[PDB]
Amino acid sequence: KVPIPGVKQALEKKEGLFRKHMMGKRVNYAARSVISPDPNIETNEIGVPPV
DNA sequence: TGTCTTCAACTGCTTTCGCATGAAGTACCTCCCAACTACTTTTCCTCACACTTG
């Protein structure tokens, strides 16, 4: 009945410590935001909000 | 003596990335707690009978 996981469960499945914190990670110096159109910028630029 | 064949039980996975917002188990046990009522507690107060008198 929901037995605390051991190191084998800790390392595998969807997570696989390898998959959730090694093959992909959170990163610093990053932001996420809803994108808004704008034709006046270059086609190679990105409009960054002053925040 | 030696090699071969099918079935059923067992293994591991089968969208990604984030918000929310975290909450909730529970038997067995209880000692603690809050209660109503009664009972008990500490200081204080005030009167009273007998022998004897004449």
Side-chain angles (χ1 to χ4, degrees):
Chain A
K1 16 79 218 12
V2 199
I4 63 180
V7 288
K8 185 139 173 294
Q9 283 57 358
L11 184 51
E12 238 85 331
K13 250 148 79 234
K14 193 21 237 283
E15 295 358 290
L17 187 145
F18 296 111
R19 283 185 70 236
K20 82 192 178 178
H21 312 300
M22 311 183 70
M23 312 271 85
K25 305 189 190 158
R26 308 197 160 284
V27 295
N28 213 30
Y29 307 108
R32 179 170 182 117
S33 180
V34 62
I35 53 162
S36 302
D38 200 351
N40 297 297
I41 61 181
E42 193 71 13
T43 53
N44 71 23
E45 282 172 347
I46 206 62
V48 184
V51 65

